[PDB]
Design an enzyme around this catalytic site. Sequence first.
Site, PDB file in Angstrom:
ATOM      1  N   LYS A 237     -12.899   3.104   1.122  1.00 39.48           N
ATOM      2  CA  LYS A 237     -12.637   3.091   2.546  1.00 39.48           C
ATOM      3  C   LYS A 237     -13.824   3.703   3.273  1.00 39.48           C
ATOM      4  O   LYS A 237     -14.252   4.801   2.933  1.00 39.48           O
ATOM      5  CB  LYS A 237     -11.373   3.862   2.856  1.00 39.48           C
ATOM      6  CG  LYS A 237     -10.157   3.306   2.145  1.00 39.48           C
ATOM      7  CD  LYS A 237      -9.019   4.314   2.110  1.00 39.48           C
ATOM      8  CE  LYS A 237      -8.399   4.504   3.498  1.00 39.48           C
ATOM      9  NZ  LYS A 237      -7.357   5.572   3.446  1.00 39.48           N
TER      10      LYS A 237
ATOM     11  N   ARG B  95       0.824  -1.218   0.000  1.00 39.07           N
ATOM     12  CA  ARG B  95       0.000   0.000   0.000  1.00 39.07           C
ATOM     13  C   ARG B  95       0.855   1.264   0.000  1.00 39.07           C
ATOM     14  O   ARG B  95       1.695   1.480   0.897  1.00 39.07           O
ATOM     15  CB  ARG B  95      -0.949   0.005   1.184  1.00 39.07           C
ATOM     16  CG  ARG B  95      -1.579   1.343   1.492  1.00 39.07           C
ATOM     17  CD  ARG B  95      -2.360   1.238   2.785  1.00 39.07           C
ATOM     18  NE  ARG B  95      -3.014   2.488   3.131  1.00 39.07           N
ATOM     19  CZ  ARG B  95      -2.726   3.201   4.207  1.00 39.07           C
ATOM     20  NH1 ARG B  95      -1.773   2.789   5.043  1.00 39.07           N
ATOM     21  NH2 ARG B  95      -3.385   4.337   4.432  1.00 39.07           N
TER      22      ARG B  95
ATOM     23  N   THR C 232      -6.099  -1.273  10.493  1.00 40.29           N
ATOM     24  CA  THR C 232      -5.660  -0.156  11.346  1.00 40.29           C
ATOM     25  C   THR C 232      -5.545  -0.512  12.813  1.00 40.29           C
ATOM     26  O   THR C 232      -6.518  -0.913  13.444  1.00 40.29           O
ATOM     27  CB  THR C 232      -6.534   1.127  11.223  1.00 40.29           C
ATOM     28  OG1 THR C 232      -6.409   1.684   9.896  1.00 40.29           O
ATOM     29  CG2 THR C 232      -6.067   2.177  12.265  1.00 40.29           C
TER      30      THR C 232
ATOM     31  N   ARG D  14      -5.729  18.760   8.006  1.00 43.49           N
ATOM     32  CA  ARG D  14      -4.537  18.709   8.871  1.00 43.49           C
ATOM     33  C   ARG D  14      -4.247  20.064   9.534  1.00 43.49           C
ATOM     34  O   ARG D  14      -4.696  21.116   9.056  1.00 43.49           O
ATOM     35  CB  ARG D  14      -3.307  18.216   8.087  1.00 43.49           C
ATOM     36  CG  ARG D  14      -3.446  16.830   7.485  1.00 43.49           C
ATOM     37  CD  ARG D  14      -2.083  16.222   7.150  1.00 43.49           C
ATOM     38  NE  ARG D  14      -2.204  14.808   6.789  1.00 43.49           N
ATOM     39  CZ  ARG D  14      -2.228  13.797   7.665  1.00 43.49           C
ATOM     40  NH1 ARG D  14      -2.072  14.032   8.961  1.00 43.49           N
ATOM     41  NH2 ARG D  14      -2.382  12.541   7.239  1.00 43.49           N
TER      42      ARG D  14
HETATM   43  K   LIG Z   1      -4.432   8.038   2.828  1.00 41.00           K
HETATM   44 MG   LIG Z   2      -8.193   7.014   7.211  1.00 34.83          MG
END
Ligand SMILES: [K+]
Ligand SMILES: [Mg+2]
Lengths: 498, 498, 498, 498
Positions: free
Chosen positions: B238, B49, B296, B90
């Site tokens: 996702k 990934r 995760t 962010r």
């Molecule tokens: K990402």
């Molecule tokens: Mg994420």
Amino acid sequence: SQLEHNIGLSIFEPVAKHRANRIVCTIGPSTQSVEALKNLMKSGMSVARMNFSHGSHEYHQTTINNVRAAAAELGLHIGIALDTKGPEIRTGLFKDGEVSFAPGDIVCVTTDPAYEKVGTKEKFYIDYPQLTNAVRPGGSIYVDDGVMTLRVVSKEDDRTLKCHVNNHHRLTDRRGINLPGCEVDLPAVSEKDRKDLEFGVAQGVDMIFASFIRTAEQVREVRAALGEKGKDILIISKIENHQGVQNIDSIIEASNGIMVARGDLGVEIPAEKVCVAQMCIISKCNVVGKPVICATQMLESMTSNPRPTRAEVSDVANAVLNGADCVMLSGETAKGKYPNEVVQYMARICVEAQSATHDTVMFNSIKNLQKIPMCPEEAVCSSAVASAFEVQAKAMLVLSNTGRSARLISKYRPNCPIICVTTRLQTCRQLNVTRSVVSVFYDAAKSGEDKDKEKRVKLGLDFAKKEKYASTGDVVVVVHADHSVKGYPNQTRLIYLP
Amino acid sequence: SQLEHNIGLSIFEPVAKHRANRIVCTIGPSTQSVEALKNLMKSGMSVARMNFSHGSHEYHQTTINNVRAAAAELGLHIGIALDTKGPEIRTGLFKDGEVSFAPGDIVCVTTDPAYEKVGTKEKFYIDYPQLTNAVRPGGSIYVDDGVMTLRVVSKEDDRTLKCHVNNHHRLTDRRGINLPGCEVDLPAVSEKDRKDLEFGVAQGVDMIFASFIRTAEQVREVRAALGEKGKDILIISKIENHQGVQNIDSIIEASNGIMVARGDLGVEIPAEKVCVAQMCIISKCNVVGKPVICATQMLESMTSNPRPTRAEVSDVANAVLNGADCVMLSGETAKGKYPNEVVQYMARICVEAQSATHDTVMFNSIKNLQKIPMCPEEAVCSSAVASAFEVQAKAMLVLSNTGRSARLISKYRPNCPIICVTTRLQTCRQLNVTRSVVSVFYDAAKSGEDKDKEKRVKLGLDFAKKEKYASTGDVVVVVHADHSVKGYPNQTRLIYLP
Amino acid sequence: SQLEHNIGLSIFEPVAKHRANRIVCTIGPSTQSVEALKNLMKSGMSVARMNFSHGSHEYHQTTINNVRAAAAELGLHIGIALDTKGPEIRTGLFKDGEVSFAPGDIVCVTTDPAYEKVGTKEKFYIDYPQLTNAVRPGGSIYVDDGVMTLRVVSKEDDRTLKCHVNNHHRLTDRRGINLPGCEVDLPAVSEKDRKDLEFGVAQGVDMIFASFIRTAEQVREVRAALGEKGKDILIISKIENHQGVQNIDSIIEASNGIMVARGDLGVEIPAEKVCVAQMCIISKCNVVGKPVICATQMLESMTSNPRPTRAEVSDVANAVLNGADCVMLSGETAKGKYPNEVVQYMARICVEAQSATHDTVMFNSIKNLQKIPMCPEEAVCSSAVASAFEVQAKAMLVLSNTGRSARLISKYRPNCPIICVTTRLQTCRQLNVTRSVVSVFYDAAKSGEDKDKEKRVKLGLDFAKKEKYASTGDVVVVVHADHSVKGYPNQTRLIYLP
Amino acid sequence: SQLEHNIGLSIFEPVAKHRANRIVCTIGPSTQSVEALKNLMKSGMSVARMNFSHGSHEYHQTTINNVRAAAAELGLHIGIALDTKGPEIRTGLFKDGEVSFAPGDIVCVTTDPAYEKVGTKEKFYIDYPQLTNAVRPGGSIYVDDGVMTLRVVSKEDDRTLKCHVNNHHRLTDRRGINLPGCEVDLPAVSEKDRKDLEFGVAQGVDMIFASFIRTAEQVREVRAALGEKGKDILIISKIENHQGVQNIDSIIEASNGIMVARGDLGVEIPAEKVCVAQMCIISKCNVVGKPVICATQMLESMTSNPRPTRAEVSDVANAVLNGADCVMLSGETAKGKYPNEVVQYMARICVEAQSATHDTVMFNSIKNLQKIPMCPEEAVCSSAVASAFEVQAKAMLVLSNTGRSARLISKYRPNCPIICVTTRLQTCRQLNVTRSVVSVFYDAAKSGEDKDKEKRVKLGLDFAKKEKYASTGDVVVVVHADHSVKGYPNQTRLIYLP
Ligand SMILES: [K+]
Ligand SMILES: [Mg+2]
Ligand SMILES: O=P(O)(O)OC[C@H]1O[C@@](CO)(OP(=O)(O)O)[C@@H](O)[C@@H]1O
Ligand SMILES: O=P(O)(O)OC[C@H]1O[C@@](CO)(OP(=O)(O)O)[C@@H](O)[C@@H]1O
Ligand SMILES: [K+]
Ligand SMILES: [K+]
Ligand SMILES: [K+]
Ligand SMILES: [Mg+2]
Ligand SMILES: [Mg+2]
Ligand SMILES: [Mg+2]
């Protein structure tokens, strides 16, 4: 099917109001104060665990006293558990107090006590006299909670093995030793444990968490050490190694309960096989209707962080889905920075797993594996739970003095609270390790004999109303004896709350 | 029953010899060299990934080239996945590189770029220009994967919010922001995402992991951005927020597969609900036969430690038991000290959970939920799996060019390997996200058309023999078309290895 | 559940178009003419039964010849079954040719052949030498098809019992004797049976219905009597007494098939236990996949009336629901006034029971009791049937030379026709006792070897179209071998009719 | 599975000692004397059916009186059922008492009373005045329980139809006519029915078997005709035609129970469909817990023979296996030579089928179809049955005044007797149509109120002991209310026989 149940789950729906699973917390410097313990209790602690690996009797006395004061202030019944140190195998001492090893290093390990205090890189002592019978060439010896690994290359004499060192590590004096896959002939109770159990009996602890239980005989030796004065204290056997797992049936038969002590267990058997053991042990306890506690590192990172890892959340949810009555916290409440938050998360995670559980699947699965014919109390109890699903009862109510009938009802995994009206305070405390159960104390010395159950039943239905389990016009399933039968319940009723 | 299956589990039986589940590893500093990648592959990586949250095109090019070089050296087909930045939010920089916050600390956050590099305890930058429309006073701003909260006291002006700090955090450069329960209006494909996607098509990546997918519409936007030359690239959506979970059905229908992105998800919705979403999402994917990756913090502590916690082992095992095709590592391999070991543990945990899985429960649950009548190829594929169970086949063998038939067999969860002979190298690489499938490349341009299938079947049977799946006299279940059907498989054969 | 399936049944819906069950008819003076037999065949007779209890070889030759002419005229394949007389026990003769008995009468019955022809009220002969070992005091002897009953009071000598007469009855010369619940040591084949079997082998009969089969050894003696010339003729064992029922497992293993011969069976065991035996025997045959015929009095009153009783209709429906391949007619077609109508009713009743059958319940139940691992032909065949349910196939097609594969597919109880393309006429005839099967003959001598199956398959698909089983664009499930495997089918295909 | 249950069945095991199913007998010439009735009762009759198709009030009075006298002599409670004539259609008389018809015989049928007594081969009377509106040319008239057809050639005039005779029949006085597929517009309660119903109320009959019920409306008309004094009398609706089957759900909802009246039904709809209707109707009744009787030609041949056919034994056994509470005899006992024997066979067949029944399959199927939440009494009754299975109880004991609770327990099909202590003699008699129930009368006026239930429970436990259901130390499941609930049972107890 589990799969069809999954696809129809909803994250948005309201969750269950009444938490069924139960939370054991280890007390320590983070949580020993009366104030700390009150908050732990408000947060969801049901049983307080004293780890007698560490601390003096004086230290644990403060815990006992503080737990009792904290609970009395809130009017709660909180179980107190004594978790024994247990027997252990250790290395000797080393010269200069440490030695460093490297992969490839050859080292003799000896059972000759002459070498006890003069461990070197070349040769050191392990205090298990049977060592050269228990581990054969090719076998492993684990040192320091598995962190260093030795392969036995050969037997030199009847007290000495030549070993190959597998990885870098620095040994200090008297490290733990594990012998993975080896029978281990250590006594059920060490000398230190006797004095610890004596203390527990004297202070009126509700249950022992008994370390390193390998055989049913060892459970019996723990019962014997508790003597007549301690005949009523639960023995929860901690399953910690391969023998434990192998003899689980007969250990379950001898114990009042089980702890899947994953920490030691993950040192003794490959870490990946711990999930197999966990699933098997929990299910076997569910089948016989004995409480089972899942332990160790469930919310570990919350020792230091205010939120748990994703792994950790799933670990707690999955122990609940596997069927565990209790989940446990060690370091997280003994010494962590967020004892309250961690218990709160664990409470929330439990409630979610509970709400995502298929109501009747456990009930049916458990009932299908019982031997027929059942004893009549067990027929009464399973059928009471059945009838609770049928009328969508909001609570059940049972009269239990020893706790037997309450545990029998919980065995069948109703989806509602099980209110237990008992005549013993110790029973209120012991039922804290049993899924769904909420205890109320009936004082016979003060309100009288209650041969016809009516006062205990009233007390229970009043408790159901006050705690907001049910209200006026809701059906409650009520289990006790009729007017003449003694020693177990032979009767179930459906009662509308007046 | 699950309960009856559990009580029969043993830690003393041998485990499965061929790992069914598949491991995705994130590449970073720990793991970008050709050498490091070779070891990841040997340790069990199937898909590399690339996390386009960070790094330039040039950095990812080095990743792409090094993956190919390492895979070629070993003769493996390793998928390459591009994971988009997406609608991320962010912080800016701070003077010195941290600032530190106390509770009750009142702080100004600003969308004004001017403060980008120069953030302090008092004022700092957040790169989402519509911030002061998104969250109003009394709303909450989550910071750095959820570890620190701020309440919004007031809107100073269109560029600045005054914020109460709720807890205790030390804050590094460019950390993640989440705004749960806020109308955040950012594109699925930013300008930056569009370049990254084009670069992926140019470089021939096998799959996109599309961040923060909220709607089937957004999936189609990622499809359009990939353009004509990119139409055979898998889109794995996702699921990372509330709306992703709400829209899961139509998101699944638009996607080639799904990632349960537990990191952002467990901040965007309460963390205890992630376990319910996981179960729900994985099962829905299993039902339509689309790959699903559980991601995760699975082995998080192994970022720094040589051993995982008990929670993390159970997390992995339960992702497998839940039905997940793949499990994912992030920081554990991108930047940890123990990338090879963490992949090795994961592979061992996968195999344990696979061995604890009931043979046929998944097969039947999945089958019972399919609309009748099926299309012929699905009847052939589900019946082929059934006949594998019935003869205890050690392997299945399927011809697949697009991968469709291999995924269709895999949807019915056989307990043996599914050897897929394919005529596209890209199919080999994309099938790395499908449980059980092992790919062999048949180069039709070099070896000829193979209308009667005998070349490809021979190639797959010899592979079965070489890789030690089966031997002479073992039965193999072989699925392709007969001599005249084109477009899908209409035929099943049972064949003894010659 | 059967109950939920019942409540959703509809009398109004159209019924199945293609009758799955099969009808055996006994030929006699009502039905022996070529014209009679043609109409019997148009009415639904699949197998013609010759009862060799009555009639000469000359008589049965006419049946054989007429059946062949009748079938040839209609282009049908009709099985011909020879139903043996079997060994029997009989009384002697009486003075004046008869004697009348009353309840309370005491009578000696003897095994002394001196008394053979001089039977009185006081004493008569029974021709079974072992009698005074086989029936003890208190036991019963049944005389004249159960119509008179004797209780054995005592043994007088080793050849004589004193008996108590239970009911009014008039005996004539040489009545049948049954010994209920007694082992009976008579040979599998009488002298008369040998000459009858010899005749059957010479005339090319397709199956023997072998009377009074008590043990597997007796089935083997019947196979032996058929010798090399008759090695291919089915042996259908008639279960007629308690020993038959007790040894059913090993009798099923030795036979090609079973007949629940309810007539004799209801004399030997209490009439009410015949339903238990029937259900058990049919189900056991279903489990191993051997044809089973239910017999005797199914539509009895239609011997004389043009409509059946309500009991009779349910009897036929229930034999079908129990799982029987065939149902049978005796007197109803041998000598009744309405041979055509009775076969027509039986056809209609079958079709209704078939339509009211839950499709997949038999399939699943049968498949669940098979030992794993299966042989691969049986995996191919069960999975073919599965895939036929999955695509709602309208027919299946199988290539079978011996009939084995067709019977294997029928074992799994598909809800559609099973077209069998065979290379043997005798196989077309023998498959008449197998549920669902419809045979087509492929003439290899005339059309060639067909190594690649294509001609036989074409022939089958053409038959499917012509008989209106399926049409253009419908899926048919096709079972045979691939190009190289010999002796069983290892391949299933789904084919659209062109 | 049913299949796996069947293969385990044995003809060598003892059968159940207490017959669960119940037998209804029609009284006529064979069986009207006090003596004949005593023997029917001893042989196993539970309910005496009066067929008001024939006979005067005076004749039925003799039946009522003789049933009571016989029942009193034996100390039994025997129900008495009045079966209405209803909208019946009959022929008139003929000169001599037969005429005989050949096929192609052209015959005039007339509604003109003038021809009532004087019918011939050429003209005869049918007592339905609207005949020539009901059936038009090309329609069909069925005669004498369906044994002879006539096609209608033309309407001569409003009183006369010219008819082609289709087959061969010898025709006796006043035979039944059916007109399938014809709008026949006759009342559910004729004037004649109204008198008969009033006579039944006056005489205190226990139940009405209402002929040709077509609608819930008609059931209510029978209810109204019974009036105030008749409101506690069961109405059992006979389903006898196409429209009855169509309307079965709302007919069941209006009725106290159902009879599958297979005689008229099998003429009104094709005879082969009756088996589908039976299954469907019985199961629907089992589901709502209403009694259902299977009727007609069950043991028909035993009208003249001492032994039933194999079809008739299986018919009875399968009615029981289908779920029927009761099975019925008509001509077999009204006018046969062997009334006592036919009842005895039926009783023995019932017990066999009951013993071949899988314990718990019915319990679970019925339970799984009930709406949740249940009313409390239903949760109590279904759970009581469950707990009977679990302790292998030899009896259950329920207090029921109306019979509701006894029917509710019976709905869940326990495998043991259900002893019902009731305070109404009429309840004793009406519970004869409910599977398993055995009634004991508690005379509250004579023995007192029994608020605490101890009198009635004692009476039922002593009955258990006397009738040899259970003995000392056996568990019994006892269902009634606790000390304060009125109107239904809220309580279950398990009790050991003292
Ligand atoms: K990402
Ligand atoms: Mg994420
Ligand atoms: O203490 P356990 O073993 O649970 O037994 C409690 C049961 O026994 C009974 C009868 O003996 O207790 P109690 O005498 O206190 O009324 C039941 O009422 C009660 O449900
Ligand atoms: O006669 P049975 O035993 O049914 O075997 C038939 C099977 O064997 C095969 C292969 O041997 O026969 P065939 O050679 O006639 O083509 C399969 O094609 C066919 O389905
Ligand atoms: K400890
Ligand atoms: K015969
Ligand atoms: K009537
Ligand atoms: Mg330890
Ligand atoms: Mg015979
Ligand atoms: Mg009628």
